[PDB]
Design an enzyme around this catalytic site. Sequence first.
Site, PDB file in Angstrom:
ATOM      1  N   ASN B 190      -2.657  29.341 -34.754  1.00 12.69           N
ATOM      2  CA  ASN B 190      -3.025  28.993 -33.457  1.00 12.69           C
ATOM      3  C   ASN B 190      -1.485  28.812 -32.679  1.00 12.69           C
ATOM      4  O   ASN B 190      -1.363  28.366 -31.737  1.00 12.69           O
ATOM      5  CB  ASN B 190      -3.663  27.810 -33.387  1.00 12.69           C
ATOM      6  CG  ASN B 190      -4.723  27.435 -34.232  1.00 12.69           C
ATOM      7  OD1 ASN B 190      -4.912  26.620 -34.921  1.00 12.69           O
ATOM      8  ND2 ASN B 190      -5.828  28.420 -34.135  1.00 12.69           N
ATOM      9  N   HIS B 192       1.109  26.648 -33.322  1.00 13.69           N
ATOM     10  CA  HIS B 192       1.288  25.275 -33.334  1.00 13.69           C
ATOM     11  C   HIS B 192       2.307  25.096 -34.344  1.00 13.69           C
ATOM     12  O   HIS B 192       2.200  25.744 -35.706  1.00 13.69           O
ATOM     13  CB  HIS B 192       0.059  24.392 -33.217  1.00 13.69           C
ATOM     14  CG  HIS B 192      -0.414  24.367 -31.836  1.00 13.69           C
ATOM     15  ND1 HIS B 192       0.270  23.678 -30.819  1.00 13.69           N
ATOM     16  CD2 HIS B 192      -1.683  24.999 -31.587  1.00 13.69           C
ATOM     17  CE1 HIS B 192      -0.958  24.172 -30.028  1.00 13.69           C
ATOM     18  NE2 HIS B 192      -1.934  24.762 -30.239  1.00 13.69           N
ATOM     19  N   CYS B 227       5.865  19.114 -31.457  1.00 12.71           N
ATOM     20  CA  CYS B 227       7.024  19.711 -31.003  1.00 12.71           C
ATOM     21  C   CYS B 227       6.707  21.023 -30.477  1.00 12.71           C
ATOM     22  O   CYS B 227       5.777  21.727 -31.648  1.00 12.71           O
ATOM     23  CB  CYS B 227       8.092  19.876 -32.357  1.00 12.71           C
ATOM     24  SG  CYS B 227       9.273  21.042 -32.019  1.00 12.71           S
TER      25      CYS B 227
END
EC number: 3.1.2.14
Lengths: 268, 269
Positions: B190, B192, B227
């Site tokens: 995804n 991330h 982050c």
Amino acid sequence: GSLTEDGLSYKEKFVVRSYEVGSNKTATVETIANLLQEVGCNHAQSVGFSTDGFATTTTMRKLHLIWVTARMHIEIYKYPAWGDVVEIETWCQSEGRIGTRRDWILKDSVTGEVTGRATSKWVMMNQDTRRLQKVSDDVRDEYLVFCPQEPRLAFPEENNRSLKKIPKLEDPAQYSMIGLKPRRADLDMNQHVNNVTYIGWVLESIPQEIVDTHELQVITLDYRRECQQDDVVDSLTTTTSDSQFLHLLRLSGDGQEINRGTTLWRKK
Amino acid sequence: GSLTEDGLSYKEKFVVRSYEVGSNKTATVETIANLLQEVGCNHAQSVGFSTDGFATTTTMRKLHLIWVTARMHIEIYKYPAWGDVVEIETWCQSEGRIGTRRDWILKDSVTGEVTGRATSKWVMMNQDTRRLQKVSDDVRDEYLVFCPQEPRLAFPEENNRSLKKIPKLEDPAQYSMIGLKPRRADLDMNQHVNNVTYIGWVLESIPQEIVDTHELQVITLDYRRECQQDDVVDSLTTTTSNDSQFLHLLRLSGDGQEINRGTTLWRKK
Ligand SMILES: CN(C)C(=O)c1cc2cccc(F)c2o1
Ligand SMILES: CN(C)C(=O)c1cc2cccc(F)c2o1
């Protein structure tokens, strides 16, 4: 995994893991490169060579000699999906006094179709002085009893992409990713930067729009010098065109070249 | 791998790979954390939940709700060597309206001895607004038929390390590693940052002399904020202590916004 019936090649199956895939839900080229390294290491263990990535003999070890990669070339037709089983077959061949070659063929385990192929050139180097040297008869004969005698090539075609000369990218680069540094996960057991990290660093300067609309089909990478654990790298890329790119990795300060390469991408 | 006989836990074996080991020729804690993640994902797939790391239901997907890790706690007694086979058993439990817990037990496949254990706390969050929420009966009931009914804990002990409050490191830090940035290999499907990258970043500020003379025994990590792919992180560490303990803080390089805090315990080799 295991050596094949004639003992001259090694095969192993891998199931693609959840953290090994990208945005397409298929294995990244760095996951593929790690699997190529793993099967190469298991082939070396199976016949008695060192298992530290250098695949050395007792004679080489006493002389402080190692094998290092000079060039890696990978062509993928289909990246395996999460949960898929990929079978990889690997073998080596001496290339006279110059060095050795390791080849790989990747297949879909269910269909038996070839989904990828790779080749790598290795040279002999003294691990302390970093000086290259030709391969002597004594070291060559230790390896020859574990290689096919007749040529067996993953890239047989004349004038194929694996043997093309790579030019040096001229400043200014079209794209760049600056200040890249390895972390402990990028190091091998000997505290050296893993060869696959450099593939990742080359790819960092490809724009995200290319990654989102294209699939990497071919990557050729020359290894000129190591990046040490406390070094900082800049990754540079220029479009040369399917989309083709020319790449250069160099140390952030003095601009010393560490790698050069090319990539070929197909529209999804 | 497979669900166990009662269908309330999942087991899987892994052979430690050449590129998965450190200087000791044994698996790194990040390799262990990736294996915990892989077995959790295979457990979710086996019973019909999503396989994107969020382990969601169809009801959660329509409401744009996901599960995110709030805390990870790992204790390793013996790191497996290259070529060794490790067996990992995992299970989940609802923790009322707060969230859920996923536990793991690592064993040496040849001896059957427990070589490690881990626990993680997960909370429900709306994917878009990033707002946390309590777990309703409808969501809870979908998961409960796949969990043990009686409590089953990897860390049962009364004064155990997995539930201790972690303080915030005060400037100046004793040690630091600045300007850490994720690359594409640090991202999940995804886009991330993978949870294991943060463990790696925390460990970057431990001096190399500690890594060379000690082995990591316990790591507890709180996850406060993500982050992003284009963010830059600073990793800070201060010694708090034959055992060495450290306090850790990850924060964004610019504004100093906290992303994680944690503690590590190391024993002399
Ligand atoms: C770079 N080198 C030297 C190797 O990787 C290598 C060569 C070789 C020959 C037979 C059998 C093997 F396993 C071999 O490994
Ligand atoms: C963080 N979460 C919500 C999970 O990972 C999770 C919970 C759960 C319950 C039963 C069975 C499973 F596979 C489960 O996976």
